[PDB]
Subunit: 316 residues, 4 copies
């Protein structure tokens, strides 16, 4: 998986992700309207106060999101964090206790600013409990973003709960976020500027085409390598103007780092690949997506009809 966020010149946020997996899970776009029942395992039951949109699965009326974006421009995506993610055995007295799957709607229902999320997370405890005993707990970490900033939330056996500022605007998979940040220093030799003709003891050695400054940029799907390339692309992509251009910029970056079917076979013999790419545009409250087997950009929107519906809206 790869998460990505950036803004245009006017503070309009474009934020979304690739889902990289070994099979399709039957997921689809879900709009959860305002005032929808919202039960919690450890907090009081309530209702949604903000409409949200994103990709996921409905389990007994509960929209279980892989990524989720609210009508006020704040979103969260859960990405795989294997060999690291570990949540608490039960609830802890005094904390805001969330079963880990509940973070998606807890963040999107209760906040519009990442600065407020970061403060509240200081007293949050994520619990190792699924929606019901039939389900496995997903070993996730999360990227959360508004138009001003993005944070990473990781809860691991190694380090406990950590919250990081993410000025790069990207996230992939394991290892932990500080490891990846540290890894970037090993790629300071990258430069968008082309090399020029050289004399190696009088032998003319000159580029054959453009791109020579990025020698050493990895193109494989190892999470550390996708992190380096996604960060490098995001920080060097110019700011662009308008909805079409920013959505296109978003898909240009995420499709560059997509996991291409047939190029990765996991140890169990299945192809791992980017099953979908999705972008939420806060300015238009529109969720854009395409799939490995259908490249057409589909659009779904939070508007006066969908935000005020009396049931979940699901698209398949």
């Amino acid at each position: 998986c790869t998460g990505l966020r950036f803004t245009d010149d006017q503070g309009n946020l474009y934020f979304g992700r690739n889902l990289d997996v070994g099979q399709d899970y039957g997921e689809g776009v879900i709009i959860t309207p305002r005032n929808y029942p919202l039960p919690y395992k450890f907090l009081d039951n309530t209702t949604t106060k903000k409409a949200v949109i994103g990709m996921g699965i409905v389990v007994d009326g509960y929209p279980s999101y892989f990524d989720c974006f609210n009508e006020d421009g704040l979103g969260i995506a859960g990405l795989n964090f294997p060999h690291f993610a570990k949540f608490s055995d039960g609830p802890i007295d005094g904390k805001i206790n969330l079963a880990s799957y509940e973070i998606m709607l807890w963040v999107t229902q209760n906040f519009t600013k990442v600065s407020d999320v970061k403060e509240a997370l200081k007293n949050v405890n994520l619990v190792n409990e699924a929606i019901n005993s039939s389900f496995a707990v997903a070993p996730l970490h999360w990227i959360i973003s508004d138009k001003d900033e993005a944070i990473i939330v990781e809860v691991s056996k190694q380090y406990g709960m950590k919250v990081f500022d993410d000025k790069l605007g990207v996230l992939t998979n394991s290892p932990d976020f500080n490891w990846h940040l540290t890894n970037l220093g090993n790629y300071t030799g990258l430069d968008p500027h082309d090399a020029t003709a050289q004399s190696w003891n009088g032998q003319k050695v000159a580029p054959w085409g453009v791109g020579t400054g990025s020698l050493g940029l990895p193109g494989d799907s190892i999470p550390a390598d996708r992190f380096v390339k996604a960060a490098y692309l995001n920080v060097n992509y110019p700011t662009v103007k308008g909805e079409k251009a920013n959505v296109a910029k978003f898909f240009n970056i995420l499709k560059s780092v997509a996991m291409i079917k047939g190029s990765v076979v996991n140890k169990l013999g299945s192809d791992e690949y980017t099953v979908y790419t999705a972008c939420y545009s806060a300015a238009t409250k529109t969720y854009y997506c395409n799939f490995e087997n259908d490249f057409e950009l589909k659009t779904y929107k939070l508007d006066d009809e969908t935000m005020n519906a009396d049931k979940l809206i699901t698209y398949h």
Copy 2:
């Protein structure tokens, strides 16, 4: 630039390219209909035998294509070949002489099968002449494909005129095609299959995520590196079924090897990037494309209306 072709389970061809450039050319989609005027510099002027679709510019009613696909399923794309491409000073007696830009319509108008193109090219000479004196000659090489096979055409100072079979179904830029084919042998260590946990003198060393078998696959835009990656992706991508899935597969591969804006700055100070990606589906006679600043898949079709028009149709 990257050119790409493959087929589905039933011989339906998907063939197209990324156009990677550092300046604007004002290109757009052009349909050239049947029976349309077709002048040649060194051959008799004639009319089109069949309809074609592709991306290009119109110069005095002449559709000058960057990539061209005919209604019978045969296409050609011209890609940059700097430091290598060199054409003849003038026409040569006894040869079928084409100004280099004329190869696009000569191939697509006169043939259906690459095997026939390959035989005809034995007597073709490409000439260093532009469409008119206001244009420079583009230093190109070409990929030509039907549903059965693809060939590369290169005319260089180094090697003269060469025609290669291209079972990889890809082409990028310089150096020459045999150099790239030879380079692939240095990447035989690539393996789609993930590594598994290992013991390094008793230290458990294990993958953190999937993808470890392709260690060393380059992700930069140097032509040799995009060639390796595009070839690796194309030959390992499963065959898929149906128009939507094959078009999606095509864009999945080409967007993976696209030149991303801001990541390449040429020696003149300008960004080099993939300005458009295009796919021609022979089965539906449809040209699909999107652009760096507009990701929506646009479609243009050779149909009973467009193939029989009286003028060029430009979008």
Copy 3:
């Protein structure tokens, strides 16, 4: 810098390092004999319990070692750890306080087995103080080894004092040791076994020579890259028999990952390179070394003469 250890089939230890620097320090081989004065900043002054050999400089009769090996087969090497190393502001009550430079002789004078060093380090505090005001404190981390095991000692602002088991038998420079161990999982695609001929959609793609399984092994001098290569080489080098063969194995590995003069220019404009490579053989109590400008293997030995001298012996 790169530190390296391994044993032969008989438990004979070979342990040493490359010194990679941008300026020379005038170092040379020093033997410190038994019963030699040994002052400490924060502990009682004493005399040496054991003879030691290694590379260093002498400061007012004190041998300040870059790497140090005792007559009982235990050694230590200090390697650069910039942007991480941080020692305490003065001594701390209730700890065994050592100025960081004193760790070299504290380890080699007081112990034979790493297991005892590891336990003793639980009560050690390293202090940010140099031997005298003429010297800065070097930002180091250390590898310590006997014939059974090796440990890494790191004291950082980020993590405090950490002691790690080092089954790989290698160390380089920054970042921290756990970062490097974690990085190895990203190189599990490395395989000593050559690839073989492949069919890329019918194009025969075959190796041109041996080595194809290690595609992606980095050859630059960035510390993380030398760590990967040094670890990979050490764990895959077979065990070899006898003194000459093991010393040769040792130099073969460290010269492979040497920092070659002219290939690295630091931000202050100076060449950084491997100024010397050194190997201590515990079995023969012999220190072997060569230098960037003199490749002859020089040898120096702890023996009944040198171990019992009344002064430092310098070469």
Copy 4:
């Protein structure tokens, strides 16, 4: 294999090679004195006129060299060139016909200047014949050097006989020399100068140690990769002064690109590795070498005794 040459500040040549193999050939240092019998398969028999030194095997009194250096400062090394090397089925009328193994002594006995070798090779034909029926013909290519220049000699099925100027001073294995020269342009992003701290959208991204400018330099033993690294190291290594420093520089470079035992396992299951490294100093007429299992620098010399001996001198 890797071949390497360079000079000091005064035109003194240092020239030699790594021998990287996957079996034992029984090689040793051979001095062939003046006036030694020199039979030819397709030329009149003669005797040696110049003493030579190098590594090789003796076959029924004939010194068959892997590398060979004459007393006048001109040398030649034969390196593997598999999947390319192809010699003629028999002798060709009008040419100077040499069985391929005979080039070693033909070059070193008849010339002192590469410029003269280059001219003479215009009429040389290499023949696919071994010294006797118990040996296979080795698929080699050659680097020949004097103090002024080096040339590469390749005879392939692909290209026939080609002779290249080698300003890089290096050679490895397949593919052909022009392919490798062309490959270097893909590595122009290499820079010995370290990167410095950067701001990635306000995230401070800074090097952890020196070496960052050579990101992408390959460290594996694939011939194309060793060619890039050896060329990069040779052209960036400063010119150094004096015999000791130049021999050291030479071994520093070749040991950096050595094939390390255990890191390469061929398709037959055998370790491929650098079995020896050797350097000929023309100024001292001295052949320096060491071995995978014995790192001591051994020295063998052409002097008034060895050059005038009555039989081969073997070590």
